[PDB]
């Protein structure tokens, strides 16, 4: 029964990820909200707050949203493969078979249970050969979360904030004396999506790689 | 008027320190004013390294901490050289023609920062390990 539910979750992931990519491609040349989309290319910020609002209307943004769904999909795939094989390698297949049919089992007997040693790679009493993976695990969480900053907060807040920094630099003696060659400006609209997603996805993979390797190497 | 007028703005107890620092002083050449900036900055940069370092109860903590301090001056000698190549591309003129506005003496500033920086790092090494 556990394998049944997950296979439809994986199916859900493959269909939804394809949906985002297919709708983005088929509407790339144009839609009702933007009939001449093809004239602006693959990647452009939007088309302003008019016509109701047009954020994330470019074909590039569709790929961008789909990167969140693939990670989720490949995550559910790798989460499943790891937990199932974990029982199989320990010869105690009963844990997966009974706990995987409800999500609290995936939260208590998979993530929380197998993170016991990893999270103890170093502590107030010492450190073991898993301190690297434990540091990387925390490292991954921080850069994952750092991506949320670019994805939730947009250009305008930052551009106005940067202006006060430009003012402050120019009016402070012993620092005024030196100058930038390139005028400081906030990251672009498209740039931020890319920078946020890159942090998110580097963090997504680096966190899981640290856990996967350390959890399995600890018990074998 | 463009600039705001606070009662503590344009105060001579504050503006007098600016016109007599070795960055705005009138008589200094770029070799002299870079020697004075480096002698002050190198003197306190060996401060944090010798009592906050990876090795502090050693032979050893004062020598290696002072070695890290001249390590920053030769790094900031490169940044002062990198800022000079970028911001003075042919020593781009301007309205005021200071050392910092158009360069025109900038290679003497970066060299003077290195002598006064690495000297006062080594001078403060004499005052902690000896004296």
């Amino acid at each position: 029964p556990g394998d049944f539910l997950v296979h439809h979750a994986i199916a859900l992931g493959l269909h939804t990820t394809t949906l985002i990519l297919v709708k983005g491609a088929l509407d790339a040349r144009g839609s009702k909200l933007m009939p001449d989309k093809k004239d602006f290319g693959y990647s452009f910020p939007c088309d302003g707050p008019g016509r109701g609002g047009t954020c994330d209307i470019s074909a590039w943004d569709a790929f961008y949203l789909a990167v969140f769904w693939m990670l989720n999909t490949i995550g559910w795939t790798t989460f499943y493969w790891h937990w199932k094989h974990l029982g199989v390698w320990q010869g105690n297949v009963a844990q997966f078979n009974e706990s995987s049919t409800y999500l609290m089992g995936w939260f208590r007997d998979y993530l929380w249970l197998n993170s016991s040693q990893l999270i103890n790679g170093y502590n107030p009493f010492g450190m073991n050969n898993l301190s690297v993976w434990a540091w990387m695990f925390l490292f991954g969480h921080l850069i994952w979360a750092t991506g949320f900053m670019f994805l939730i907060s947009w250009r305008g807040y930052w551009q106005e904030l940067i202006e006060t920094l430009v003012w402050a630099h120019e009016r402070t003696p012993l620092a005024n004396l030196v100058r930038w060659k390139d005028k400081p400006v906030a990251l672009s609209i498209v740039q931020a999506r890319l920078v946020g997603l890159a942090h998110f996805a580097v963090g997504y993979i680096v966190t899981y790689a640290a856990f996967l390797i350390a959890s399995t190497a600890s018990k074998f | 008027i463009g600039h705001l007028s606070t009662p503590i703005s344009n105060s001579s107890a504050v503006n007098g320190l600016l016109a007599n620092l070795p960055a705005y002083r009138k008589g200094l050449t770029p070799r002299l004013r870079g020697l004075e900036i480096g002698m002050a900055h190198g003197y306190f940069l060996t401060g944090p390294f010798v009592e906050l370092g990876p090795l502090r109860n050693t032979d050893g903590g004062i020598l290696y901490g002072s070695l890290s301090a001249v390590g920053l001056v030769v790094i900031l000698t490169a940044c002062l050289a990198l800022y000079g190549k970028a911001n003075f591309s042919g020593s781009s003129k301007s309205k005021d023609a200071t050392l910092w506005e158009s360069g025109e003496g900038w290679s003497d500033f970066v060299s003077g920062w290195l002598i006064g920086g690495a000297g006062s790092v080594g001078f403060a090494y004499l005052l902690l390990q000896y004296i």
């Binding site: 060659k181 390139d182 | 790094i75 490169a78 990198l82 190549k85 970028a86 911001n87 591309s89």
Partner: peptide
């Protein structure tokens, strides 16, 4: 032994050189 020499070169010295090489290349002009 050769690890002790090489990992501060490409860890500290060589990134300081290529960042110096790329920074002058960016801010040059015709």
């Amino acid at each position: 032994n050769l690890p002790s020499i090489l990992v501060p070169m490409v860890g500290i010295v060589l990134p300081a050189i290529v960042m110096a090489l790329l920074f002058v290349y960016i801010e040059t002009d015709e």
